[PDB]
Amino acid sequence: KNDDINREAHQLNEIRKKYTMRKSTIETLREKLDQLKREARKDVSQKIKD
Amino acid sequence: SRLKEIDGRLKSTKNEMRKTNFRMTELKMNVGKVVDTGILNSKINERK
């Protein structure tokens, strides 16, 4: 019984870490890329007016 | 006197058996510590 419950725990721990992995995808790709593209503009009205 | 010595050895052996069994079971319980194989894969994929 202990081994079965431990296997279930390991499966659910891997599941939770996959969830954390998707959270990391959110943090970097969703936001860090969003921030990089938003600031990469530097409001092109800058270079245009240059 | 020899009987008392052997009985003391017997009790010490029983205590050692109990300690070893409990340590074995603690080693079993150490498998349950949260091992994580998550977030790193996302960054691996992004970097690749």
Next chain:
Amino acid sequence: DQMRQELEQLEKANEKLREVNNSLVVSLQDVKNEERDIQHERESELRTI
């Protein structure tokens, strides 16, 4: 897994402890039988004298 390796090693150690305990109990029972025999001989000789 390493904890499982130490689990196996200490299982072997516990089995060795079981064998040692059984041998010690064997010796204890033999010496108890010797005690009973010596005590019975003492009782018989003291009664006779």
Next chain:
Amino acid sequence: EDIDIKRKEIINKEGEIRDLISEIDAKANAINHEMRSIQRQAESKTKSLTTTDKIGILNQDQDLKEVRDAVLMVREHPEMKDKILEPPIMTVSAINAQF
């Protein structure tokens, strides 16, 4: 965390039960050697000559016990066996009780 707690509880139960295994082995060994000792005593009593031979008759008196010990030493001593024999109570048998 809940599964870890349950695993630790069950594992401590397993350890406690495993403690009550070699202790049972100790009890079994003690009882087995009790068996062996008592059975050896029974076997020795069965081997007893139950006073059949006159050497067994010698078991019935302290001086006769000394005579029995002398007879046993004579049996163990061939040089003291050819020259010195068992007493006529043992070596010599009368035809009947009246003889």
